[PDB]
């Protein structure tokens, strides 16, 4: 019910000036703000307090405090986030980079 009310309020405020936004975006926003047990506010005290990649939260406003917390807790980062790959300068698992391209040695012979 809280998620539905939040979505309705978002739709009302967006449509107050007449602008139109597709329902899917609002649904995704409310879902991410409500994916946890409660409502995760979009602030440095909300989603930034989750257990996501340390570098991903580092890029937010809290930069060195999160690093100290990770060092104290020895947090492990799987580098599946966008920020981790961007910092590492590697193709992130995004769209083209989500998958990988290989070579078929059996089709090559017949295609030649």
């Amino acid at each position: 019910a809280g998620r539905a009310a939040l979505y309705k309020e978002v739709y009302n405020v967006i449509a107050s000036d007449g602008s139109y936004v597709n329902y899917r975006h609002m649904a995704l926003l409310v879902d991410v703000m409500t994916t946890q047990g409660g409502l995760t506010s979009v602030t440095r005290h909300g989603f930034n307090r989750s257990n996501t990649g340390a570098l991903m939260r580092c890029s937010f406003e809290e930069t060195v405090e999160i690093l100290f917390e990770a060092g104290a807790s020895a947090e492990l980062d799987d580098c599946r986030g966008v920020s981790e790959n961007v910092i590492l300068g590697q193709m992130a698992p995004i769209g083209t980079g989500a998958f990988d391209v290989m070579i078929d040695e059996e089709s090559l012979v017949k295609y030649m």
Binding site: A1, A4, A5, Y23, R24, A27, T35, Q36, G37
Partner: protein
């Protein structure tokens, strides 16, 4: 099921865990005056069995923590008495699609 009129003293709250095998839930008279499920905003919540949970995890290939979380003190959870590690299916009506089915696991 035990329902109180005004409030519950902390002594009863700490005594409730004294009986593991028997689960006791405390509800307020004011809270239960009007049924929450009858509200339009709240979707339809259906409890899922352990076998259903295992099948869902196998098909979607999810772990316990990957599923959406729901607070223990959530009014819906208290209404259904959901326990820890229990998955509940939520069927909702939306404008973009006729219905949508999600799942929530208590934390």
């Amino acid at each position: 099921i035990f329902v109180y009129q005004n409030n519950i003293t902390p002594s009863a709250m700490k005594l409730v865990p004294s009986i593991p095998p028997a689960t006791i839930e405390t509800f307020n008279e004011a809270a239960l005056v009007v049924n929450i499920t009858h509200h339009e905003l709240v979707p339809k919540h259906i409890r899922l069995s352990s076998d259903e949970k295992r099948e869902l995890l196998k098909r979607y290939r999810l772990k316990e923590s990957q599923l959406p979380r729901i607070q223990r003190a959530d009014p819906v959870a208290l209404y259904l008495g959901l326990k820890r590690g229990e998955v509940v299916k939520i069927i909702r009506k939306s404008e973009t699609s006729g219905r949508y089915a999600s799942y929530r696991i208590c934390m």
